[PDB]
Amino acid sequence: LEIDKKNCCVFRDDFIVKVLPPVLGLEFIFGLLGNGLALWIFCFHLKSWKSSRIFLFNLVVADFLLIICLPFLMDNYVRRWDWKFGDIPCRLMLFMLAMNRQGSIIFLTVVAVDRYFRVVHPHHALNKISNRTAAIISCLLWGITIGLTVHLLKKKMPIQNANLCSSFSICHTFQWHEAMFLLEFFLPLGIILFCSARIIWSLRQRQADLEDNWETLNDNLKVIEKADNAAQVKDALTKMRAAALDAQKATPMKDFRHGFDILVGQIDDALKLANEGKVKEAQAAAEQLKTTRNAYIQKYLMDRHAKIKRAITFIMVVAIVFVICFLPSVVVRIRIFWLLHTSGTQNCEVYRSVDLAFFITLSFTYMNVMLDPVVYYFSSPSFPNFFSTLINRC
Template identity: 35%
Template sequence: DGGSSLCPPASLDVHMLPPLLATEFVFGALGNGLALWIFCFHLKPWKSSTVLLFNLAVSDFLLSMALPFRASYYSSGIKWRFGGTFCNICLFLLAMNRSSSTVFLMVIALDRYMRVVHPHHPINSLSISKAWCGALALWLITICMTTHVFTLKHINTTYCESFMINTQPGHNLIWHKFEFIISFFLPLLVILYCTIHIIVFLRRRQLAKDAKMKRVLCFLTVVAVVFIIFFLPNNIMQLLIWIKTKKVSSTLQESEVCPALEDLTTAFYISVSLTYLNSALDPLVYYFSNSAIKNSCRKALHLPQANTAESTGRKTREPGSQSLSQLAHRESIEGIIEMEAVR
């Protein structure tokens, strides 16, 4: 129908959201800003995977820029004070960069999978210029998927919610819900597929017994789990709201529908704010998981370089029962996962 997809949030208990959004803004802006500075001025040479990481950082940084306005919106008692046009701009930034962030995470997972499981595939030799063309194509796709936000008409000028909107025609809201859900579940399936196949591949090659490779496997698992933790609850809430709305709309009067959905609606607003935490924490993944970025960051901030004892020990490691080719293969995979296609 032409009604709102969520009930008005004026009565919701969202007092915890302003400090949460403010914290996400500080960590997201500073962390991703530092990451972009490192990428632009201190990380050389670039590779195709660097292009993907750079665009992920851009997406996360742009998303962070909209968070102070959302924090102000909730702290003022859910009253939007910046006009309808800027409301749609902020909603577009949130929707577009949330989708682009998950899309780039998906492509980075595919890149890592191809380099580890299919190291001789021609796509692994993609030039920087072609990688940029691919990144621009991904941006165009996500922009086209979310530009409908500008066509949505709000039912109340004091509210700034993309899920509490009357639309003309009604299919805009249906597409908005579909894009919201598919931008999580499609990347989730790809990330899980790539992660599981990398783990199976390493175990099949008997590389998972090495202490270094165990850390790599643990990291790959953590990345997938963190993605699920931040994004799955929000999508479950959206699905539950849709199911319960259909149910209560047929049994209750219109004035009773919103009170029946209040708990789920509150949970939705809280869970959607938690998804932004993923973008705020991405810089930690850059730093702690990619040696090239870590060393560039330390150098740019004039910090002492990391202890190279491990790498020195790796070079002097006795091959033992392993052949030189097996050892080289293991070293190659370690380097691919750590240096080329982390996250």
């Protein structure tokens, strides 16, 4: 509440002391349960480590850095920022808190960039990265996360004012490091938003092409069944045969590839019956095409339509989690940069309501430990298959 030293106006509303501690606890419970489940599924349930799970497992590592500090953080907010712990416990908590935020920001982009190449550029060299190469990338990206946040271990803590454990970054005017801080968030924000746009755009296109081929197939058969001309059926099978050949090249399955062989072959048989004036004998042969697509095709259409739906769901939650967790604190920090430049630090009451917003959006930053489990769930069908086979045992 009182004006701190070195031109620093800080406020501790009662809403922060009363509402945030139980929020920190809920984020601690679901975060430990979700990441603990992920840690079990990643490391013990499945034995195959792909390049995507290696990049994705870093979020689990980045989340446990915040999970460890959450009980201590609760102890600080209930004590009104009275840091009962020592010097070293405070430096480590600030380091791990920044390591969790900066680490989650970086690896949520790597997850989006990885899925961007799996979808948009399937044949690019970055899709064939070895597990050792992906492990080198993750280590190099952790080394970057170290350097950006290692400075929080140099400053001695706490600071008497009762002792407070905080890196007062909301009392620093906009300078070079603060510009770096904003750029370290907006470049990943631009990459994730662009990748999410391209992936959703490309995947909704593939689904629209599958349903367009399947539409022209069922629709054309209804023409053949309702046909009263011998020439109408010759042209109707033409659009079907072109649709059956387009669907073969679209699929990026052993019993589904040979199903189009039988599908096209049955069209060729009725194609000869259509050219011989067999109006009734070609309309009937076209009904055998209804029994082959149910047994052979419709299953692969639903499997791919679900694979596409889960991929779009995955890239959306990665973008949504990145925004609703890290953007609110950024906007508030930008508003403080303006007020320090506009109003200065003579009258502190200009920062009363803004400080309440900062610690509110600060708990949004801590939400990434209970929302990353949602990212893990939609990453691969192995996660829902873990709980489905676990519930199979009843």
